[PDB]
């Protein structure tokens, strides 16, 4: 199945690299593009499926 | 940006282009000019009591 089909590699570029602060370093996680500082806060309550949090 | 919590929503706003500057007379200016205008008004020579004391 040429060029056709489900199950394939997906060796691209994808935004999972050494995330750092002091800097607003480019975000694309989850579908939402923006521009923003990191910052380490310890976040432990989150559930098992959690991966965001908004306002 | 000097570190601190988001918890508002001044940051978000301030860097979308809706910013409040300051007034050109700050609110310690404008008290100071109601103390003023107060002490007069009692120690002499009145001037907010049409020349005569408070009491």
Same mark, same amino acid.
């Given at each position: ?55 | 940006?000097?570190? %601190? !919590? ?15 500057? /300051? &007034?050109?007379? %700050? !609110? ?15 120690? /002499? &020579? ?10």
């Amino acid at each position: 199945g040429i060029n056709s089909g489900t199950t394939c590699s997906n060796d691209l570029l994808q935004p999972n690299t050494e995330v750092f602060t002091d800097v607003c370093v480019d975000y694309d996680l989850y579908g939402i593009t923006g521009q923003g500082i990191f910052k380490e806060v310890s976040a432990v309550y989150y559930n098992s499926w959690q991966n965001l949090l908004y306002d | 940006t000097g570190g %601190s !919590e988001i918890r508002d929503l001044l940051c978000v706003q301030s860097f979308n282009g809706i910013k409040v500057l /300051p &007034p050109i007379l %700050s !609110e310690s200016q404008i008290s100071g000019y109601t103390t003023a205008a107060t002490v007069a008004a009692m120690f /002499p &020579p009145w001037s907010a009591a049409a020349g005569i004391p408070f009491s």
